[PDB]
Amino acid sequence: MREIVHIQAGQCGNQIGAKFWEVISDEHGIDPTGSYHGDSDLQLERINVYYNEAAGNKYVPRAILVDLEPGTMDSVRSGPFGQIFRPDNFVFGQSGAGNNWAKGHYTEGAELVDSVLDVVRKESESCDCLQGFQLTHSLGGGTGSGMGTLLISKIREEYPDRIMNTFSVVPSPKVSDTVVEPYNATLSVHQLVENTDETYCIDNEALYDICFRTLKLTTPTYGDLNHLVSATMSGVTTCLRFPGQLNADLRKLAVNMVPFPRLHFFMPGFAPLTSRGSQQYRALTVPELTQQMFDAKNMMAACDPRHGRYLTVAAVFRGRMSMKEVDEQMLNVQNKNSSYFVEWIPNNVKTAVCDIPPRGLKMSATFIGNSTAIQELFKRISEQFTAMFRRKAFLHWYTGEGMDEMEFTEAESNMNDLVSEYQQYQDAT
Amino acid sequence: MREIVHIQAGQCGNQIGAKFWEVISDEHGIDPTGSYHGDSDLQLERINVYYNEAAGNKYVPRAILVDLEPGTMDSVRSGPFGQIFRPDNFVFGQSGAGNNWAKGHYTEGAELVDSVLDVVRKESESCDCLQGFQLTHSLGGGTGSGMGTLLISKIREEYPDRIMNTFSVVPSPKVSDTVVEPYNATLSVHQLVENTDETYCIDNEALYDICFRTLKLTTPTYGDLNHLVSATMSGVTTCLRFPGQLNADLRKLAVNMVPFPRLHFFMPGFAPLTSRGSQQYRALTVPELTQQMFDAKNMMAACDPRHGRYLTVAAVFRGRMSMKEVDEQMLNVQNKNSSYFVEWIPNNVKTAVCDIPPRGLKMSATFIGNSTAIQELFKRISEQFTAMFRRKAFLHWYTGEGMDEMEFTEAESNMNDLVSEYQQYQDAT
Amino acid sequence: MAVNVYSTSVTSENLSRHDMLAWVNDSLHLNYTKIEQLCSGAAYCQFMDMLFPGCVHLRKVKFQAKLEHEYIHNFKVLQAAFKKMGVDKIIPVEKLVKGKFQDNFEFIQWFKKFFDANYDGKDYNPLLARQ
Amino acid sequence: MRECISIHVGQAGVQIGNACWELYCLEHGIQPDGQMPDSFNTFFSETGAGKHVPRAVFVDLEPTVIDEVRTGTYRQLFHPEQLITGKEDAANNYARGHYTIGKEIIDLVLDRIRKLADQCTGLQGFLVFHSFGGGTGSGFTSLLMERLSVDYGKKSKLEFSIYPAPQVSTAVVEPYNSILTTHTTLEHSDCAFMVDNEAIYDICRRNLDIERPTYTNLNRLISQIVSSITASLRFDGALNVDLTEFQTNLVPYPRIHFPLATYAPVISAEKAYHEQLSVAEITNACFEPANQMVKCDPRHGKYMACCLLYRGDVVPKDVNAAIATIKTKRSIQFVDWCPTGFKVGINYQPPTVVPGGDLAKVQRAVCMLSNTTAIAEAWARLDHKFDLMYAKRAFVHWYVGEGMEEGEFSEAREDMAALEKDYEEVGVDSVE
Amino acid sequence: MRECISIHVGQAGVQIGNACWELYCLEHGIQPDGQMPDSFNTFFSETGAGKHVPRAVFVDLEPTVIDEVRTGTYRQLFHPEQLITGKEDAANNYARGHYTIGKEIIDLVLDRIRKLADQCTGLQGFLVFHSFGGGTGSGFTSLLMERLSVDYGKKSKLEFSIYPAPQVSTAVVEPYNSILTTHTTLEHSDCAFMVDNEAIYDICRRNLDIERPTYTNLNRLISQIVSSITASLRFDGALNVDLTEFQTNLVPYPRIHFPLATYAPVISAEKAYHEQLSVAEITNACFEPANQMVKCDPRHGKYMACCLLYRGDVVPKDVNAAIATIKTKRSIQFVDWCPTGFKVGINYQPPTVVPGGDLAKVQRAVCMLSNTTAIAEAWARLDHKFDLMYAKRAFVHWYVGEGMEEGEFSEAREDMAALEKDYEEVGVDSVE
Ligand SMILES: Nc1nc2c(ncn2[C@@H]2O[C@H](COP(=O)(O)OP(=O)(O)OP(=O)(O)O)[C@@H](O)[C@H]2O)c(=O)[nH]1
Ligand SMILES: Nc1nc2c(ncn2[C@@H]2O[C@H](COP(=O)(O)OP(=O)(O)OP(=O)(O)O)[C@@H](O)[C@H]2O)c(=O)[nH]1
Ligand SMILES: Nc1nc2c(ncn2[C@@H]2O[C@H](COP(=O)(O)OP(=O)(O)OP(O)(O)=S)[C@@H](O)[C@H]2O)c(=O)[nH]1
Ligand SMILES: Nc1nc2c(ncn2[C@@H]2O[C@H](COP(=O)(O)OP(=O)(O)OP(O)(O)=S)[C@@H](O)[C@H]2O)c(=O)[nH]1
Ligand SMILES: [Mg+2]
Ligand SMILES: [Mg+2]
DSSP: OOEEEEEEEHHHHHHHHHHHHHHHHHHTTBOTTSBBOOSOTHHHHTGGGTEEEETTTEEEEOEEEEESSSHHHHHHHHSTTGGGSOGGGEEEOSSOOTTOHHHHHTSHHHHHHHHHHHHHHHHHHHOSSEEEEEEEEESSSSIIIIIHHHHHHHHHHHOTTSEEEEEEEEOOSSOOSSTTHHHHHHHHHHHHHHHOSEEEEEEHHHHHHIIIIISOOSSOOHHHHHHHHHHHHHHHHHHHHSOEEEOOOHHHHHHHHOSSTTOOEEEEEEEOOOOTTGGGGOOOOHHHHHHHHSSGGGBSSSSOGGGSOEEEEEEEEEESOOHHHHHHHHHHHHHHTGGGBOTTSTTOEEEEEESOOOTTOSEEEEEEEEEGGGHHHHHHHHHHHHHHHTTTTTHHHHHTTTOOHHHHHHHHHHHHHHHHHHHHHHHOO | OOEEEEEEEHHHHHHHHHHHHHHHHHHTTBOTTSBBOOSOTHHHHTGGGTEEEETTTEEEEOEEEEESSSHHHHHHHHSTTGGGSOGGGEEEOSSOOTTOHHHHHTSHHHHHHHHHHHHHHHHHHHOSSEEEEEEEEESSSSIIIIIHHHHHHHHHHHOTTSEEEEEEEEOOSSOOSSTTHHHHHHHHHHHHHHHOSEEEEEEHHHHHHIIIIISOOSSOOHHHHHHHHHHHHHHHHHHHHSOEEEOOOHHHHHHHHOSSTTOOEEEEEEEOOOOTTGGGGOOOOHHHHHHHHSSGGGBSSSSOGGGSOEEEEEEEEEESOOHHHHHHHHHHHHHHTGGGBOTTSTTOEEEEEESOOOTTOSEEEEEEEEEGGGHHHHHHHHHHHHHHHTTTTTHHHHHTTTOOHHHHHHHHHHHHHHHHHHHHHHHOO | OOOOOOOSOOSSOOOOHHHHHHHHHHHHTOOOSSGGGGGGSHHHHHHHHHHSTTSSOGGGOOTTOOSHHHHHHHHHHHHHHHHHHTOOOOOOHHHHHTTOHHHHHHHHHHHHHHHHHHOOOOOOOHHHHHO | OOOEEEEEEHHHHHHHHHHHHHHHHHHHTOOTTSOOOOGGGGTEEEOSSSOEEESEEEEESSSHHHHHHHHSTTTTTSOGGGEEEOSSOOTTOHHIIIIITGGGTHHHHHHHHHHHHHTOSSOOEEEEEEESSSHIIIIIHHHHHHHHHHHHTTSEEEEEEEOOOSSOOSOSSHHHHHHHHHHHHGGGOSEEEEEOHHHHHHHHHHHHOOSSOOHHHHHHHHHHHHHHHHHHHHSOEEEOOOHHHHHHHHOSSTTOOOOEEEEEOOOOHHHHTTOOOOHHHHHHHHTSGGGOSSSOOGGGSOEEEEEEEEEESOOHHHHHHHHHHHHHOTTOOBOTTOSOOEEEEEESSOOOOOTTOSSOOOSEEEEEEEEETTHHHHHHHHHHHHHHHHTTTTTHHHHHHTTOOHHHHHHHHHHHHHHHHHHHHHHSOOOO | OOOEEEEEEHHHHHHHHHHHHHHHHHHHTOOTTSOOOOGGGGTEEEOSSSOEEESEEEEESSSHHHHHHHHSTTTTTSOGGGEEEOSSOOTTOHHIIIIITGGGTHHHHHHHHHHHHHTOSSOOEEEEEEESSSHIIIIIHHHHHHHHHHHHTTSEEEEEEEOOOSSOOSOSSHHHHHHHHHHHHGGGOSEEEEEOHHHHHHHHHHHHOOSSOOHHHHHHHHHHHHHHHHHHHHSOEEEOOOHHHHHHHHOSSTTOOOOEEEEEOOOOHHHHTTOOOOHHHHHHHHTSGGGOSSSOOGGGSOEEEEEEEEEESOOHHHHHHHHHHHHHOTTOOBOTTOSOOEEEEEESSOOOOOTTOSSOOOSEEEEEEEEETTHHHHHHHHHHHHHHHHTTTTTHHHHHHTTOOHHHHHHHHHHHHHHHHHHHHHHSOOOO
16 A cells, blocks of 8 residues: 655665665664564554565565665665665666766666666566655766666656656755766756656755754764755655544645646755754744744755745644644744745645654654745756856767767756746746 | 386486485485385375385385496486485496487497386386376487487387476577587487477576576586476476375376477476575565566576467466465466467466475475477577588588488478477467 | 777767767668667678678678577677778677677777778668678 | 776886885785785785785886896785786887887787786776886887777776976986877876876975985875775775766866876874864865975966865765865866866775885875866976977987887877867866 | 506607506506505506506507616506517608518507407597607507507597697608608597697796796696596596597597697696686686697687586586687687587596696696697698608608508608698588
8 A cells, every 4th residue: 555666876875765764664663684673553554655574574675776886785785774675676787877977877877777677667566556756866976867867767657657756966056076067967857857746855065054053063974964864755755654634645745836747846844953952942842843944044955945935835744733733833934924935826835744753753844845946056057067068078978978969958958948937937926 | 196207318317317306205205215204194195106115114216217328327326315216227338329319319329228118118017007207318418319219219109198208408509518419409309399298498508597697696506407407397296296276287287288299398487586695585475476487587498488479388386375366366477468478379377286385485386388489499409400411510420320311301301390380370360 | 901990088079879870770771779789790790891892701690680699690700800801909799799788889989980990982782782 | 896907017107006005905904925814806806715916917128126026025915927027128218118129018918917807897997007208108108008998998097107397307308208108198098197206205305304205205105195096996985986987077178188186194193293184174285286296386277177085084064164165265266167176085994004104194184186277387398398309309319210200209299289289278268 | 347448659659658647546546556545447457456557558669668667666557568669669760660660569569459458348449649750659550540440440549649840840751750640540540639749848838937848747738638538437527528429529520530639727836826717717728829739820720629628626607608708709710510619528526736746736627629720731831841851752762661662652642632622621611
């Protein structure tokens, strides 16, 4: 009953993915071997959403791990929880893509993709009623971006009526992690616009800010960053996995959040977030949570929501709380912040409530904003792309793999059109 | 009540045969001395199918071991289980055939054949109701191929109303094990087409692939390969030896699988097949088994079933399982893979179920496919034969033993006709 | 005597998948839709005939090959043609015959360069060569 | 799995190789006899029981330098067939290296490479160590590269080069050798990492307080840089970079494939105790011109790519912070066609320190690979040097005597002229 | 049961025999006195109590070489009647070997063979060791073969031959001897395994690092090859090959019965420690022309049959894999009439190593027997040599003086011409 198929591509994709898996196992009372050691029957009721039941009281993640290099896979295998994964679901190459989108999409990735697809099909067939797919990856590298997009394209072709959702780690504005990342992102976005139903934009710049400023982590590590992402991810599927009072799911959320097909790029957020010492000096009531949710400093995408307008917002609450109170809070935010919400979508806040809170907390909240400010990010990428492409810098690395300028051009154009569309709705009255 | 007489020819024939015997003894609770040390009365009920009861609570395989060289026989005798065999049932020459079909069929083999026949007749007379004969051998050498075919011919003449089944190890496509193997195979096939009721085509190329890719055996050995073959073999007779819910036997299987007399060459398969570590991460339900059975990578013949159509498929299941489920699975495979099944044989899947599973497993499955793709193999052999015969290469080795070109020619023609026949049914609507 | 060339890393000296396949289809009058279809070796054998008539035993080529060994056979003919003409480039047969895109695309990149170095513009009807 | 084949050509290449393989052994816990009481495997193949053998070839045209290896401490480390020597050297003559003497052993060298490569399941590529100035380092290396390009195709090839200094030469004919080898190797190399002996000496004197640094010291320093480059492949890391990634991120146009290496921190133990070495602190050290290993001025050039490879106790956020501040800095200008100039690698393993070495043990290190229009200056200098001698045909008769043709000199020079112009063109900012 | 009778003719045959029987004794644990403190039995008959005697005949026309055996370490190993000597040698004259001197001992030799054969229950056949060049090796061997053909009929006969080198001769009349003996033996031999002293010397120098290899070394090497051929009969194996199988799988036409032997690996202990010797690795070694034991170029010929005999720690799948990759390789071309070119044998017993030998102890070995159109070159050379001397009738008077007729020379030559043409015809590919 509503199986989700999980896919992880590249280093980023696999590191976030592992963390996510760890989070989920703890929630469902699953230990590193796949055995259930939980307390309550509710933990097992909907375990089939993420786990296949194997022989002898074991549960195995419906997870496929993909990379053109093996080192990350090895690391995962050696990690805490590494042994829970099905060995045949690790599909790795030997070559790599050399941070090149073309290599991931057309060359090395192409050589590996069939093997992935075979696994995926089997996984799909395992499920009684497949909800769809969640892909974790970056847009800036070669495998996650090129191979990942290719995978998406094929999956969509095979299963056009199932939901495709992605958790994409997007390039940062202040500093680049690779030199060709604008190319890789731009290409990837071209695929994503046509082939995903929803995309959560996660940015490391935002994450670091959150960790340093809000969480008071002097020197946050990638693991810590991943944890936040995992928390968000778990939040989005909580209403599918536990009984609630007003229950959401992936389809409903998409419907509420996506008024036009191309505009499916979300700014995710999570609340609450406090230091170790600072948590004793404040109570986690719903209004506090709401307040934490609605501000620029708590968004995981490096763009200010105050630079645009919200088309829609979905808020997913976990824990025992008063529905009336929640509704009041939702009303209040809309009324007081009227100028940040588009005027032609009345009641553009959607609420979901799941009775099961996450571990350690009595209540939490997950925020999904569809904000016209995300256009800024796209614009930056377009600018960076242009600056390089006009001088044909690095181009021979991609053309050498069989790619043509036309493909690049078209991709750029598509990106530009999306930006224009975003602008149009931002400006409409 | 339904005695089977087992015959082993040459090195291959004897190595596979020994393994088979080992498998069978374990199943029926027989130790290396012939004494029953099993648990259940069901293990002894139908022990007479493969064993003669000797004086003093001992059971002896109804097995005849034949070779033109003694070394293999000696090895068998010295092996674990070597002492279980009747000493007078080892019939070996001193000369060999020098990898020459002619020597096996007309010369050295001829000198030994009468002695074999004498034993065989006695064995037949031992039995209350002889079902027939199973011969294990290769087609590529001299003894298994030439002597074996001769033996078959004589046996058929003597006992024309009994079933003759063969487990033939067929030459590989990528590499040849001997230079004259096309001649030896072609000649052998000429005899087999006219004198066997069913022939299981087993190919070492396929076997290695299975062992390396599916079983995750880095460096598989011939013993391991033989084990797989033995498992298949045991599977085919399981319904004759144990009570079941829908019981098959050798005759029934032949009837279901052979719509035209010459088309009796099967592609055998076995399921399940897993690594040592990988078995804990999956449950052996019937659908899984079915899925494992129906694919190209799990066939023990080096030909892709997707290059032809299935005329018929027999599936034999062992273990406690639901008949309904089995039937559903059978229906499902037919419906979804419609294009791979000939349209003029409705319901071309036959099912048998035996309640006794093999040791170590709760359920297993054995697959017998009559696929028009096997024609590829025959074509290859014909091509190889032609290439050599047109230049009369190596011919003096055979003509020197009294053989004429006419015999070769006729054999070639017969093979070609079979191929044509296969093609005709493949193409028919 | 036939001249020989090398390919590593150069700009404005490449060909897109589409363009390369167009070239192969126009040159040999066939209808490939994937560059990986060149893995059968028949096309390469034909190209050798067109470049250096008599360097290849085309009567031995299997133009309707479907199986790995058939493809291997074509590449043996190609190998022999290369040896006869003194082209020193090692053909990665095992990788090519698996029909992998990367290996085939790199090989055709080199082959195109080799062809351009050596082709004198003569016209021939490849249909007769084929059958 | 991801094997890396190392080739050490001529005296410089061999001697640096000695330093590199010594370091690798210490890093993987391999003794000088090949024994150890899984990460090693990219650099060492394994045989029988309790022995590990470098994936390396050492070649020189004379026996003396390699004979030291044969008779020395690591005699048991290498298999005899991977230590290749001729009889007579190339006598600082590219011609002898490329043609007369080199054509006698090239087949042998390549045959052994083929044998090495046959035992690789996932060959990443080749690391070639040599100099620009020697007859073997110039002529033989060029030859070798040509053959490798033919026999292996698009497999990644990397070069570590002792580029000639502005005012510190050994030979008189260095400019000739440098120019010809650059010309001949250009279309065959994917990326070449220049290093300059003068600069390293300065570093040794200034940063390590060494009055009289020896070639050994330089070699040791080089070994550190090489280790940083391959540590991402030999160890687990937070964010990883492989040999194929460099040429993508550091080479914007095919001919402009000369990034420069800078390592930090290079300090003595006595000096290390009074300093806390943060990521910001070492990054700043790197991005200051005095710590560079080529005697050139980046302040007078523009950056086209920077790749920063951190190792040890390093935290991604910290690195990001460090880089951000360096971006602001006046002394760091980037070309106008390149808004993203940084590629960043972070590996968990701290730099290993050779017993009896000049460097102190640190919790963090960083190796920057940067590509700068300032390198054009060096090329200009070299061309000028060539011009001065060639105008008089000084030493030309030697080259011709070894089978070179005079026209090839002019050819090499014109190609280098073109190269110089290419850099210049790249330098200028975009119209509109 | 499956007995094998060995005949050692002349100096080469006897000396190689010394090396072979020394090896067999070590392999079966038989002491030099015939004692041991069941596999032996194909090569050794057993007598009374605690003594084992070679199924062998040693023959030479002079006493000196056999006298060494009689007085030597293995004096007690052989029965006196199996060591046969005349008084005067054949003086490098085929005529003396075949007629004048040979006709005096042929009856004796055959009588002893008959006695040996009478104690065999399952005679597989004969292994005959000799050379092409000596008067005994050429003339006597031919005589012997003729008689054996008559008295035993279709029993398999195999030859191991020291074929003459291209540019390394002992005698001047070698070509005459070679040609006549090949002519006379051709219709009587089923398969003959050529080996060349030059090639073995090269192997010794190149692969074993021996400055000055002696005939002993060569003999030892030969003994290995012979052991590989008969190990399948003397030991248990996974997949087996017997003496009757070779002639079926290696001889496509009656006259084309000259396969060539190649053994791998041939290494010293010092070199073996840095190498892991896989099936693929040794197979590749074998299939490279430098490791061949006849100085000929297979790259310039085509293979008609290859038989690969593996021994020791060898796994069938691995062998299959190895062969498959070699099939792809450009340097391996097969004749068009032969889509299946490989016969493969695998035996469990690792190669035994003679104490004080030049070869290191390995887990695996392989012996290839291959038949190649490249052998035609050797024949052409030999014919040319014959022609040059015969045109002047150089040395002819000797042969005539010993009862040969001049017409027989021309006869031999024409037969060899025909043989040469037969190879040529076989070479070309099939029409349509
Ligand atoms: N860093 C460093 N540079 C070296 C070393 N040895 C030589 N060099 C430099 O290399 C150049 C001389 O080239 P060599 O490698 O000695 O010459 P070669 O390659 O042996 O060539 P020939 O002797 O001419 O055959 C000069 O610029 C030297 O300063 C060394 O151990 N370390
Ligand atoms: N490999 C090897 N070759 C040998 C040996 N002794 C001789 N030869 C070769 O055998 C040929 C000479 O023939 P021999 O066997 O000495 O002569 P013979 O058979 O005794 O004949 P006559 O003395 O003429 O009666 C030359 O090609 C020698 O190189 C040996 O111990 N080993
Ligand atoms: N939050 C988070 N971001 C990461 C992680 N790993 C990498 N990134 C970010 O993702 C980008 C590169 O991701 P990466 O994983 O290298 O893509 P890739 O395609 O797998 O890289 P490749 O195989 O082509 S070399 C960088 O911007 C980096 O900052 C991680 O574990 N967590
Ligand atoms: N699966 C399997 N195949 C084998 C075995 N032994 C041999 N073969 C295969 O069978 C073929 C040769 O079989 P072999 O047993 O030599 O026939 P034979 O007739 O007995 O051989 P001979 O007496 O004429 S020399 C080869 O292709 C080989 O790969 C075995 O134990 N298992
Ligand atoms: Mg030198
Ligand atoms: Mg003599």
